[PDB]
Amino acid sequence: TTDQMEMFRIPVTINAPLQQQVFGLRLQPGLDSVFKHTLLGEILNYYAHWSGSMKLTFVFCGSAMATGKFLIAYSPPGANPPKTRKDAMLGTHIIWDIGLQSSCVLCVPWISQTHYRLVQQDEYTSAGYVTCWYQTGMIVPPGTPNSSSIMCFASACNDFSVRMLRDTPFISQDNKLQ
Amino acid sequence: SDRVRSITLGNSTITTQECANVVVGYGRWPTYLRDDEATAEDQPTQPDVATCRFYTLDSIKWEKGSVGWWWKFPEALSDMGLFGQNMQYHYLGRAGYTIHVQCNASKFHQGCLLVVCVPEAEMGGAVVGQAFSATAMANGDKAYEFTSATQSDQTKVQTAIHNAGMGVGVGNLTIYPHQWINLRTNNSATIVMPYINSVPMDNMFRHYNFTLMVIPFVKLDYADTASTYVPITVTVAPMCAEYNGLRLAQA
Amino acid sequence: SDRVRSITLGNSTITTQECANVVVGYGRWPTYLRDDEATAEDQPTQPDVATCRFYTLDSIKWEKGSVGWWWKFPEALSDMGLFGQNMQYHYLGRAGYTIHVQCNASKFHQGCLLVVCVPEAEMGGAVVGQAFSATAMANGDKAYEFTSATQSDQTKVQTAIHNAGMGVGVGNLTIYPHQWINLRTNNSATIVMPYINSVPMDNMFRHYNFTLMVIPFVKLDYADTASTYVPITVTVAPMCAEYNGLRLAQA
Amino acid sequence: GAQVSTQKTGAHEIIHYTNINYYKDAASNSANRQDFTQDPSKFTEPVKDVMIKSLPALN
Amino acid sequence: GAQVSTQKTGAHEIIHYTNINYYKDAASNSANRQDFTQDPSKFTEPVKDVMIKSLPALN
Amino acid sequence: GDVEEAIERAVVHVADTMRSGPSNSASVPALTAVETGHTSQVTPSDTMQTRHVKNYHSRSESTVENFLGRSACVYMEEYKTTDNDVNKKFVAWPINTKQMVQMRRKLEMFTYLRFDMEVTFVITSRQDPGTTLAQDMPVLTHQIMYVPPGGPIPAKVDDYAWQTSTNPSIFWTEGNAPARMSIPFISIGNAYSNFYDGWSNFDQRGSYGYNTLNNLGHIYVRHVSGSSPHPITSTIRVYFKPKHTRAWVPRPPRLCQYKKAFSVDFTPTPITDTRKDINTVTT
Amino acid sequence: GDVEEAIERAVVHVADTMRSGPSNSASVPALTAVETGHTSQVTPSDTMQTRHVKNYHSRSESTVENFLGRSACVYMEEYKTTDNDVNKKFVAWPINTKQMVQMRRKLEMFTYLRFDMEVTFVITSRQDPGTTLAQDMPVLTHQIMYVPPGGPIPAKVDDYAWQTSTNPSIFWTEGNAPARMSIPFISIGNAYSNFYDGWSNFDQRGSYGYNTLNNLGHIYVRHVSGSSPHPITSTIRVYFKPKHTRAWVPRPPRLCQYKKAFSVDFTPTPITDTRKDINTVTT
Ligand SMILES: COc1ccc(CNc2ccc(CN3CCN(C)CC3)cc2)cc1
Ligand SMILES: COc1ccc(CNc2ccc(CN3CCN(C)CC3)cc2)cc1
Ligand SMILES: CCCCCCCCCCCCCC(=O)O
Ligand SMILES: CCCCCCCCCCCCCC(=O)O
C-alpha cells in the first residue's frame, strides 16, 4: 500500500468466479495487526484478560444502482481455517443483502472453554477466524463504475469486560523528553 | 415495511431487503411426529440446532440461453454437515425444509424465474423402455440442466423443458407450492415445505421426497453493461428433523 | 440377590450375573451443565440416545506374563459411531462415562486385576528431557502395554509398571475411583465417572480427560486345561453428552 | 464492625479474641484456619447401593 | 464516626471493613474506588430521535 | 449509630444472555445504517439461537478511578553534595506531566481532568568513584521545597530562600520510608486541560498550545547541610497518583511517538503493520 | 451489635469408643469384600471387648488450610550493583511453582487448587571480595516489578520500562522489615491445575503437559540507583503462602526424585527398602 488511506477499503469487482473470498482475518483483537490499533485494541492493550462478544459492522459504499449478496461467517477455533465457502458456511454466519439499508452487523458470539482469554493470545486461547465470500455476485447497470469498496467497524457488546491492568507496549522512549 | 424479511435457524441467519411474502407449503407448518401416528418403537434422536440450519447449495450461472435446472432432495444434502452423517447412520428420517433462492440484478435487467417444489417428481427415460442409473438425475448438490431440444442419449432422462420431464404441461406447475422471481420486483423466493409422504417415516437415501425446479419463463436480457451473467444461489435448512434406527453407517 | 446387575443406555443393554457393587465416581452422578455455570452463549446440541450408548472397545489377551495396559479417553472413542462425528464437528464437548470391564474364568483359575480411572494422568518420557509425539500413548482404541523392565527407547513413554508411568507408587492408585476383579468372586467391574475438569467444557481432541488402567497384581495361573488365555474386554458408554461450537470437521 | 470469636484451647484449661478488617479487598484478610468440617464418604464409600457393616457384603 | 461497608468478593465465596478519617481536609481521604455506575448512551446513542433496534433505521 | 454508620454499595454485573429460539418475521435487527452516527445495539440473542447464561463478570477494574489510580514516575534528576559548579548541587523542576511518556499517554486519553493528587518521593544516594574513597559520613538529610508561581527562587545551595516561612517543605532522613503528601485541586479553571488549541496574546500571537496554561510552580531539592570530603550523588524520583478522578470528552490514544515535552510535534507513522495479502490468516 | 458481632465456631473431636461385651451371633462385621471398592468401616468395638473412652483429640492441624498455610521458598537469584555484563545486573523470573522440590511436592498432592496468595520478599547484600574494599556507601534501595503477560520487558538496568505507570511495584530500603503483599485468584480457569494431560495445538502437537497453562507473568528486580565503586552482590528470596485454600481430586504423593522444572520425567525407583526375609522383625 503506497497510500495509507487505501488500507481502510476492501476492493470488490463486478465479474468474479462464482465462489470467491473477499477477505479473511484472525480474531485476535489485542494482538492482530488488523485490530491492534483500533479504538478497541488500544483499550485492550492496557489489560491482560478480556471476555465477551464483539460486533463487526460492514457498510457498502458503492453506487445506489449496484446490488449483491455476501456471506460473512465466523469459524470457532480449529486445526484448519476454512478454504472454501462450503467450509465457511458450516460455522456461524449471516447472509447480507445490499439494499436501502447500507449496513449489516455480524455479532461474534462468546464461545470459549475459559471465562477469560489472554490479550497476548497464544495457541491455548485461540479465538477463531472471520471470512467473507461472494454469495451471488455484484451486478451493475450501464454507466456505473466497475469497482466498489466496503468498510468494517469493530466494537464491543454490552457483556464485554477486561481485567488485570498492565502497561501498553506501543509507546516507548530512549531519553528524557525536553 | 413488509418487503424486509429475516429468518433465523440454528447458528445461521438469512436477511433479504427486497422480497415477496413467504409461502408455507399447503398451509401446514413443519412439526414433530405425534405419539398416535408413530409406528417405530425405539426412542428417536432429535439433534435440533446441529442439523436444523441453513446450508448453501453451490451456485450456477444464468445466461441468456439458459433453459432451467433441478435438484432432488434430500439427496442434495446427502454429504452436508451433520445432516449427512445422521442420514448415513440411521435407517429412517423425517424433516421439513425451508428453501431460499437468491438472484439479484440491476434495475436495467429483465427476466422471470419460476421456483416450485414438486413432491414425487417421477421422471421418464430418454428412450421409451430401457433404464437409467441413479446418476442421470441425482449426483449430490450438483444441478442438472433441462434441454430445449428432445433428449436422445439413452443413458439420461428426457430433459425436454416444455414437458418438465414428467409428461405434463410446463405451464401447469403452478398447482404445486411455488413462487416467482421477477427482476423488476423481487430478488428472492422463500418456500416452507412440510413433510409429505404416505408413511410416517422413510429412508432418506432410497426415496426422493421432492424436487426443486428453477425455470426461466422470460429469458434474461440486458444491453451495454459489463455484467455478463447473473448468478443464482440456493439455500436450504431442514426443520424439525428426527431420525430412527441406528446401524452401521453407509446407506 | 444383589450379585445381578443390568444397565440400559440407549439401544444397548449390559447384563452381569456375578458381579460386585457399582462405584459412582466421587459420589456424584453425571448431569447436564447448569445455566449459572455455563460460559458459552450459543445453544448446545444434545444428541441423547444417538451418542449415549455402550461401545465395545476391542479385546486383548491375558497371559501368564502380562504386566498391564492403559487406554486414554475420550481419544479411545474418537472414531466410534456418532460420538466420533460429534467430536470432529464441534469445538467443545462435555460428558460423563460408564466403564464396564468383562473378564470371566473357571473356578480353577486364579488372579486379580485392578481397574482404576486416573484423571489427568500426565506421563513422562523414557529419556529425561527429549519429547515424544502423540502416538506413544494414544492411537485410537488400541491398548498400550506396560513393561516390567525400564523403558529405553526415547520415542515412547516410560512404561515401568511399578511406577505407573507417573513417578508414583503403583500401590497407591487406590485413591482414585477403582474396583478389583478377583476371579474367585467376580467377573466384572463397573465405574461411573462424572465430568471432572477445571473448566466447564473443553476440546475433546486436545485434552485427555482421564486414563483407564488395568493391572494384574496377582498374575494369572492355572494347570491342566485347554484354555491358554483369558480374554479381557472393555465397554464404555458416554452419559449426558453435549457439544458446542459447530465448525468445519476434523480436529 | 468488630468480630468476636473463641480462640483455641491451651494449657490451663478469656478465650476470646477481636478482629477488624482494614482493607477493601477480601483477599487481604487473614487465613480462615478455624474450619474443621470433614466428610470422608466421598473416598471411603463411593458405592451406589448402601452397604451395612454388620451384614455380609456380597449377598 | 466509623464507616462500615462491604469489601470485594474473593476466593472462597466477614466481608466487612471499617474506615475512619483522621485529617481535616477531604483531599487526605483514600481513593473511592468502589463506584461502578456507567452509562454509554452519551457516546453510543447521541441521536435526537429514538431508534428502535427491531425497526428499520432509515424509514 | 453515631459510632458506626453503615454504607451500602452494590455489585453491578454485566448483562445476562436470554434464551432465543427460531424466528421468521419482518423485523430485521441485524440491518442498520451507520450514517446516523449510531452504534448498533444488537446482541447475539438477536441473530442466532442462544442459551440462558447468568454472567457474574463486573467492570470494576475499568473505571477511570482505578485506571488512573496508579503511581507513575514523572521526573528524576541528580544532585551532588559537593562540587565546583553551584548549579549542579540542587534541582529546580517546573512542574508538568509531559516529561514521561507512559503517564503522559494515559492522561491524554481525556481532554479535561479534575482530581486530587498524592505525591511520593524516592531518594537514593551513591558515592562517586575516585582514587580515594575511605571516609566516614553520618546519615544524610534532604529538603524538598515547593514554590508557588511568583515566589522567590534560590540561586545556590545555601541561599536565604531555603528558610521557608510560608512555602511548604519536607525534611527527610535516609533509611526511613519515602516521603508522601496530598494535594488538592489547585487549578484556576474548573478542570485541568491536557490540550489547549489557542494562543496567549489576544491577536493570535505568542506561545501556542498547552504550554500557555502550565503555571503550577516549581520544586527544589538539596542536601540540608551534608558536605562530604568526597563527592556523593543523590537521585530523586517523583511519583504522582490521582485521587477522586473525573474525566470528560475522551479522545483517541496517540499513535506517533513523542518528540517534545511541550509540543504535539510528531513524525508521520503508518496506520498499522502489513501482511502478505488480504486473505493471509496463517502465522 | 453494630459494634460487636459474635461469631460461633465449634470443636469437633474424633469419635468416642463405646463399651462392648461378649457376642455370639450371625453378624460378621469383620468379613467384607474389597472387590467393591469399599473401605471397611469396622472399629475395634466390633471385634473385641472395649471400655468406654471419651476422646478429646481433634483433627484441627490436618486441614488443607493449615497444611498448605506455611510460607515456602520458591525462587532465589543473585544480581550485582555494578558489572560489565548488562544481563547480570538484574533478575527476570517467569513465575511458576515447580522450581523448589518441597513446596512442589506439597502442592502436587492435589489436582486442582484455588486460593489467594501472600508473597514475601527477603533481600540481603554482601560485598564481593577483592584487593581493595575500603569504601563508604549509603543504604541501598531495591525495586520489585511485576509484569503481567504481554507487557513490555526491561532489557537493561536503566531502561524506560522501569517507570511503571500501571505495573505494580515495590520500593524497599535495606534494614527494614521484609516486603509483603496479597494477591487474589488470578487464573483464567475456575481453578489452578497442577497437571494437564493434553497438548497445545488442536491436532495433538506442540508443547505437552503443564507447561501449556503457565502464563502468570514475570518478576523483575534491580538496585534503584546504587552503583558502588566496588561490586556488591544482592540475593532475593521469594516466599509463597496460600490463603483461603480449596482442593479437589487428591492423588498419591510422588515417589521418584524430580529432574526437570517443566516436565514429569523421572527415573524408575524401587517401591521401598528391603529386609532379610519376610519374618525378620528385629532391628
Ligand atoms: C507542591 O506539591 C505538588 C505541587 C504540584 C504538583 C503537580 N500538580 C499537578 C500537575 C499536573 C496537573 C495536570 N495539569 C494538566 C494541564 N497542564 C497544563 C498542567 C498540568 C495537575 C496538577 C504535585 C504536588
Ligand atoms: C505479582 O505478584 C505475584 C505474581 C504472581 C504470583 C504467583 N501466583 C501463582 C503461582 C502459582 C500458581 C499455581 N499455578 C498452578 C498451575 N501452574 C500451571 C501455574 C501455577 C498460582 C498463582 C505471586 C505474586
Ligand atoms: C481503616 C480503619 C481503621 C480502624 C482503626 C481501629 C478501630 C478504631 C475504632 C474502634 C473500633 C470500632 C470499629 C467499629 O465501629 O466497627
Ligand atoms: C485523630 C483521631 C484519632 C482516632 C484514633 C482511633 C479511634 C479511637 C476511638 C475508637 C473509635 C471510635 C471513633 C468514634 O467514636 O467515632
Side-chain angles (χ1 to χ4, degrees), chain F residues 38-261:
Chain F
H38 180 273
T39 293
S40 179
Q41 307 282 105
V42 295
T43 60
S45 177
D46 295 300
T47 81
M48 73 202 84
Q49 297 187 43
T50 52
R51 79 193 306 277
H52 177 48
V53 181
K54 272 170 50 49
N55 289 284
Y56 292 99
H57 306 332
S58 68
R59 294 169 166 185
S60 60
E61 217 175 359
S62 305
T63 61
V64 300
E65 182 65 26
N66 285 319
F67 176 70
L68 292 175
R70 299 291 189 87
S71 308
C73 177
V74 296
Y75 189 64
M76 53 204 68
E77 186 154 25
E78 319 185 355
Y79 54 107
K80 294 181 176 67
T81 186
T82 186
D83 201 350
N84 263 341
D85 184 1
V86 68
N87 262 308
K88 186 180 289 293
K89 293 187 286 185
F90 69 100
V91 307
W93 175 52
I95 294 151
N96 69 327
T97 53
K98 315 270 146 191
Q99 294 276 32
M100 295 265 173
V101 171
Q102 292 183 357
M103 180 171 174
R104 181 176 179 174
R105 176 163 167 184
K106 280 185 66 169
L107 291 173
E108 301 197 323
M109 293 177 71
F110 310 96
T111 311
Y112 307 116
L113 291 168
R114 177 178 174 115
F115 47 68
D116 302 319
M117 185 64 72
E118 171 154 279
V119 188
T120 314
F121 293 94
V122 179
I123 297 159
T124 60
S125 301
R126 68 181 189 279
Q127 186 175 14
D128 290 0
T131 57
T132 291
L133 294 174
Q135 65 182 357
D136 176 88
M137 194 84 180
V139 68
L140 294 175
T141 308
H142 309 274
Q143 177 182 3
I144 303 104
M145 185 157 102
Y146 170 55
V147 180
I153 60 181
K156 64 182 181 293
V157 74
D158 65 80
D159 181 65
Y160 81 94
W162 297 98
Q163 74 191 356
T164 73
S165 66
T166 300
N167 298 332
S169 303
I170 295 170
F171 294 85
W172 180 81
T173 310
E174 283 206 8
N176 298 343
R180 173 176 276 182
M181 74 203 77
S182 289
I183 296 275
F185 176 64
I186 60 169
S187 180
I188 51 172
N190 298 99
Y192 294 113
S193 56
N194 293 88
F195 297 88
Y196 176 72
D197 196 18
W199 302 85
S200 56
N201 293 321
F202 289 91
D203 65 9
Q204 305 178 341
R205 182 170 294 107
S207 65
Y208 171 68
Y210 56 85
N211 181 41
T212 306
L213 281 45
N214 192 59
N215 290 318
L216 296 176
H218 293 70
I219 280 161
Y220 294 86
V221 190
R222 65 163 184 162
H223 299 97
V224 172
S225 293
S227 184
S228 54
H230 301 303
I232 293 169
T233 299
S234 301
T235 312
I236 185 166
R237 297 184 163 74
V238 191
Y239 291 79
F240 281 13
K241 161 156 186 312
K243 291 154 56 170
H244 317 139
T245 300
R246 300 185 74 182
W248 296 270
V249 184
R251 52 172 55 228
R254 191 179 167 107
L255 177 61
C256 307
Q257 306 304 296
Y258 291 104
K259 277 183 159 58
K260 298 291 185 181

Side-chain angles (χ1 to χ4, degrees), chain C:
Chain C
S1 176
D2 63 358
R3 298 296 299 278
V4 307
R5 181 70 58 160
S6 175
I7 311 172
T8 304
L9 270 298
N11 67 347
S12 68
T13 302
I14 284 284
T15 58
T16 180
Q17 213 156 327
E18 183 178 2
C19 75
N21 208 344
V22 170
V23 162
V24 183
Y26 293 92
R28 285 271 287 280
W29 198 261
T31 193
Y32 285 107
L33 183 58
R34 270 145 72 71
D35 293 351
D36 63 358
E37 293 179 353
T39 180
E41 269 160 20
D42 67 331
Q43 185 83 247
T45 190
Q46 293 165 358
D48 194 9
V49 299
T51 52
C52 305
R53 58 183 308 288
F54 278 105
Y55 302 102
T56 306
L57 206 72
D58 181 65
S59 193
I60 63 186
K61 295 183 178 180
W62 188 3
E63 306 276 20
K64 293 202 186 193
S66 298
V67 180
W69 311 263
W70 77 85
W71 298 261
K72 294 226 165 194
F73 290 87
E75 182 65 26
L77 305 173
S78 66
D79 63 358
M80 185 64 72
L82 283 169
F83 190 82
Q85 299 303 120
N86 281 275
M87 272 177 51
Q88 283 173 63
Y89 272 94
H90 290 280
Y91 169 43
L92 294 173
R94 187 186 194 276
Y97 303 93
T98 296
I99 301 96
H100 200 271
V101 181
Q102 294 100 16
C103 182
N104 67 85
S106 83
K107 288 198 172 23
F108 292 68
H109 286 75
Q110 72 192 28
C112 192
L113 295 170
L114 174 63
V115 185
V116 58
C117 294
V118 181
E120 310 287 344
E122 207 196 315
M123 292 180 183
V127 175
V128 299
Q130 301 297 337
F132 48 87
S133 62
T135 301
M137 65 182 179
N139 188 13
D141 61 356
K142 84 176 287 303
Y144 282 75
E145 280 158 350
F146 284 108
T147 312
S148 183
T150 71
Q151 188 55 254
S152 180
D153 197 344
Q154 65 182 357
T155 65
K156 53 176 66 177
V157 162
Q158 183 54 259
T159 56
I161 179 58
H162 53 92
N163 281 184
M166 286 177 289
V168 304
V170 70
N172 296 335
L173 293 176
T174 300
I175 188 59
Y176 300 118
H178 75 289
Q179 212 154 49
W180 298 85
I181 294 176
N182 189 8
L183 305 185
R184 297 174 91 267
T185 59
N186 62 326
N187 60 31
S188 72
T190 311
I191 300 158
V192 174
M193 294 299 291
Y195 175 79
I196 293 159
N197 199 353
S198 61
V199 287
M201 293 197 163
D202 214 7
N203 180 266
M204 286 173 136
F205 269 98
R206 187 161 57 167
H207 183 47
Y208 306 117
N209 277 306
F210 74 94
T211 293
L212 178 70
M213 315 193 152
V214 177
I215 303 169
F217 266 78
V218 176
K219 65 179 73 175
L220 184 74
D221 210 17
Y222 54 81
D224 271 350
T225 180
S227 297
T228 55
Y229 57 84
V230 175
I232 299 169
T233 296
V234 178
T235 315
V236 183
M239 296 174 75
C240 297
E242 56 185 350
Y243 309 85
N244 224 337
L246 188 60
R247 70 230 199 290
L248 151 64
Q250 204 51 77

Side-chain angles (χ1 to χ4, degrees), chain A residues 164, chain G residues 74 93 95-98 103 107 111 113 115-121 144-148 168 181-187 191-196 209-219 238-240:
Chain A
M164 185 64 73
Chain G
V74 296
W93 175 52
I95 294 151
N96 69 327
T97 53
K98 315 270 146 191
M103 180 171 174
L107 291 173
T111 311
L113 291 168
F115 47 68
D116 302 319
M117 185 64 72
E118 171 154 279
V119 188
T120 314
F121 293 94
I144 303 104
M145 185 157 102
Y146 170 55
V147 180
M181 74 203 77
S182 289
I183 296 275
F185 176 64
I186 60 169
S187 180
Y192 294 113
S193 56
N194 293 88
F195 297 88
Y196 176 72
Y210 56 85
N211 181 41
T212 306
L213 281 45
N214 192 59
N215 290 318
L216 296 176
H218 293 70
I219 280 161
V238 191
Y239 291 79
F240 281 13

Side-chain angles (χ1 to χ4, degrees), chain D residues 1-2 20 22, chain E residues 2 4 18-20 22, chain F residues 3-4, chain G residues 2-3:
Chain D
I20 293 174
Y22 310 116
Chain E
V4 175
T18 305
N19 182 79
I20 293 174
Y22 310 116
Chain F
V3 177
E4 293 177 350
Chain G
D2 184 1
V3 177

Side-chain angles (χ1 to χ4, degrees), chain A residues 12-33:
Chain A
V12 166
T13 54
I14 52 166
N15 286 314
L18 289 179
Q19 294 96 18
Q20 184 162 78
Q21 199 175 358
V22 180
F23 73 85
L25 61 83
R26 325 184 64 181
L27 194 79
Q28 309 185 135
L31 182 61
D32 205 4
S33 310

